Amino acid sequence: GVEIETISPGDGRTFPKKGQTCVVHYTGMLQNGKKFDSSRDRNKPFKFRIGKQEVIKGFEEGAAQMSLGQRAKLTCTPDVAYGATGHPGVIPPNATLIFDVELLNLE
Amino acid sequence: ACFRMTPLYNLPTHRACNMFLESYKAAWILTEDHSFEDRMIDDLSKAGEQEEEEEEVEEKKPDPLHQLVLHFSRTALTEKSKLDEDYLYMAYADIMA
């Protein structure tokens, strides 16, 4: 249950596949308008590898549907990311998630 | 046993060094520095109130030793059950004697 809405056009041809590195210099907010995570503030491009499930499934399946250079708006259902307990101390139980995600390079 | 003890020339280098330091406590423990004893109470305490002071009215500023002892008096009066170790007290109690 993920929804994707393009914000700026990207390459539209090259898409990430298994066994490939992805760097995501993103920012993240909550459904009510508060943001609880970012990568631009730390000024370090977050990098992760698809296929080994080191990231929440909602995020990876959302990123699988976008191309290089695209900035988009992502919306995860609470059932796909930290369903019942959540991450203690940062996010309340049973909350909707909002992500501002863009991809720098490497497909 | 004493008849089977090992010669010195078969010991590993790393082990044959720790015994040297522990055994070579025969050049500090007997040597005497003296020094800090008579020069201590001379430069400290006495001649402490130098020409730095500009004026006075009724009392005088306590000299450096005077602060030290009252500190020990200060911590002595602290309401406690049993006195602690405070090796710092030992270091100065002996040199005052």
Binding site: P88, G89, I91, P92 | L77
Partner: protein, 377 residues
């Protein structure tokens, strides 16, 4: 009953006795051998007597008609000051009843359980007695002696208040005739206003030596008011008064003339109890079992200063009570911040639930992070 005890009660108000000679004039003169006199317990407010069969029983001040008490001193087995004879600590006087002519000693009947259990013996006026009495006297006439009659007066004025208060426990008033016997209100308000001043903590501008000297003379008296009750008593008053909720309107069926003097009486107890707890360590351990009771209220519209201060002083000394909060007391005090506004006092209290003196506890140093922190309101 009368007993013997070692070096435990020797610093307590229980073992204090007063000698009252039978004369009206020159009662304070020097005490000499062969002189009838009475014995009074200071905090109990009672004498010692052997009436017919019950033994050396501590009789009240109404059945001591100079024949049951009738004590005097013996060496062995005047309109002036008088000759000074009996010294302190070495006079070795022997106690003897006048009418019965007996000698006082310990029966000491000890079974197997009593020998390894209570180290207590009973004294009896035997006809011949033992050979190891040698009762010598020690003088303790100082600030503590003044704070001995206070216990009897206050403890005799408090329980009578609750007992009178307890009569109308569940009787709505028959409007008009309020009740039977009246209640004292002006007496207690003055009484409480004295102890809070009496137990007022040492000042700040004083030097170290004077501050330390009085700091020893306050901890002792705080502990001295616990061994004679007066912690249960102040607890007992809160139980009875706190039944009447809301305001003085519900307290109407107790005498509407005393209704308008409700708030201050409820207030004055709380900071009184804070005086008996602040600073001292032994008294703080008593609230481990009663922790649930104090934390319960936290809501009365006239308790704000009292409860937040009494709770603050019990989490600053004893780490033991700090370990007896499970999951619900934390959210109770959290809700306090949500209903009484932005108060820095409560936020300071939560810092007490954190690291104690040196040692830190982790069983509760996450609940506040998951309860008052994730929500961003």
């Amino acid at each position: 009953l009368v007993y013997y005890e070692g070096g435990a009660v020797c610093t307590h108000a229980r073992s204090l006795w007063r000698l009252e000679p039978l004369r009206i004039s020159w009662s304070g003169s020097h005490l000499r051998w062969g002189q009838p006199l009475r014995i009074r317990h200071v905090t109990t407010g009672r004498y010692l007597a052997l009436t017919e069969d019950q033994g050396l029983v501590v009789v009240d001040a109404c059945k001591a008609h100079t024949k049951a008490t009738s004590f005097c001193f013996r060496v062995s087995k005047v309109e002036g000051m008088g000759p000074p004879e009996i010294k302190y600590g070495e006079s070795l006087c022997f106690v003897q009843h006048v009418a019965s002519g007996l000698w006082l000693t310990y029966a000491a009947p000890d079974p197997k359980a009593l020998r390894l259990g209570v180290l207590k013996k009973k004294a009896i006026l035997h006809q011949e007695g033992h050979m190891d009495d040698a009762l010598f006297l020690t003088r303790c006439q100082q600030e503590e002696s003044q704070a001995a009659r206070m216990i009897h007066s206050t403890a005799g004025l408090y329980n009578q208040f609750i007992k009178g208060l307890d009569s109308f426990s569940g009787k709505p008033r028959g409007s008009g005739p309020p009740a039977g016997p009246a209640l004292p209100i002006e007496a207690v308000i003055l009484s409480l206003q004295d102890l809070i001043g009496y137990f007022e903590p040492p000042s700040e501008e004083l030097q170290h030596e004077e501050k330390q000297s009085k700091l020893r003379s306050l901890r002792n008296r705080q502990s001295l008011f616990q061994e004679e009750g007066m912690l249960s008593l102040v607890l007992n008053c809160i139980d009875r008064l706190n039944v009447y909720t809301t305001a003085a309107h519900f307290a109407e069926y107790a005498g509407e003339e005393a209704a308008e003097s409700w708030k201050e009486i409820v207030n004055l107890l709380y900071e009184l109890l804070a005086s008996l707890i602040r600073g001292n360590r032994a008294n703080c351990a008593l609230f481990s079992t009663n922790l649930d009771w104090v934390v319960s209220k936290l809501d009365r519209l006239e308790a704000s200063s009292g409860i937040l201060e009494v709770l603050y002083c019990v989490l600053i000394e004893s780490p033991e009570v700090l370990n007896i909060i499970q999951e619900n007391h934390i959210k109770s005090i959290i809700s306090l911040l949500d209903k009484h506004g932005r108060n820095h006092k409560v936020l300071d209290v939560l810092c007490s639930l954190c690291v104690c003196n040196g040692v830190a506890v982790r069983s509760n140093q996450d609940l506040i992070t998951e309860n008052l922190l994730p929500g961003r309101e």
